[PDB]
């Protein structure tokens, strides 16, 4: 967890989305105490190095910055939200909400595919992508 940095103001969130031109900006929105927001914080931290060349990761806490709760509508322990060139990206995991991510993904590998898929599709301006594995059943 101490690998991955944290964002302590909503102004750290916004500049961080802007200044990274060439890579995804992946953010976990959720709060330290949570059962499920700790688990994801692991599965990302392990992956963050492998992917440094196309994706950048950060951590944010709903309690630290609540400014973003209404606009993106944040419910539940945590939401993974992908950004490329200020454009909110979007993917269908078969789960019935195409915005963000909720459920906890299981393998390191299946997580890297999703990041890679989003980036590759995203690079072409495509706003939707399809997660190869569709965990509607899972979540």
């Amino acid at each position: 967890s101490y690998m991955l940095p944290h964002l302590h103001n909503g102004w750290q969130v916004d500049q961080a989305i802007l200044s990274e031109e060439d890579r995804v900006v992946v953010i976990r929105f959720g709060h330290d105490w949570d059962p499920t927001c700790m688990k994801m914080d692991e599965v990302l931290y392990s992956i963050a190095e492998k992917v440094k060349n196309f994706a950048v990761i950060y951590l944010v806490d709903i309690t630290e910055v609540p400014d973003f709760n209404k606009m993106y509508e944040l419910y539940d322990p945590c939401t993974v939200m992908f950004f490329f060139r200020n454009k909110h990206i979007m993917i269908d995991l078969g789960t019935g909400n195409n915005n963000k991510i909720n459920w906890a993904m299981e393998d390191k590998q299946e997580m890297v595919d999703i990041i890679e898929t989003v980036y590759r599709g995203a690079r072409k301006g495509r706003g939707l992508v399809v997660s190869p594995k569709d965990y509607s059943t899972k979540y």
Binding site: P5, L7, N9, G10, W11, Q12, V13, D14, Q15, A16, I17, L18, S19, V65, D67, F68, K70, M71, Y72, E73, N86, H88, N99
Partner: protein, 69 residues
């Protein structure tokens, strides 16, 4: 991570700048009153006290980066 370092906003709202898209009291208190009227750390913590002893020279001379596989 240069921005991470800096620390100052303009007195600015987060949503707007990026270009964001969303996809008597005393009496009450009195009334209220009239009504009122971890494991891991425990396991370890005990070890952590154990550490206290160690000298500052030893803290320095600690081997640094050993790979065994």
């Amino acid at each position: 991570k240069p921005f991470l370092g800096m620390p100052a906003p303009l007195g600015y709202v987060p949503g707007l700048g990026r270009g964001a898209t969303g996809f008597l009291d005393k009496r009450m208190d009195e009334r209220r009153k009239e009504r009122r009227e971890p494991k891991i750390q425990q396991q370890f913590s005990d070890l952590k006290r154990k550490l206290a002893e160690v000298t500052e020279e030893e803290w320095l001379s600690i081997p640094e980066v050993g790979d065994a596989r």
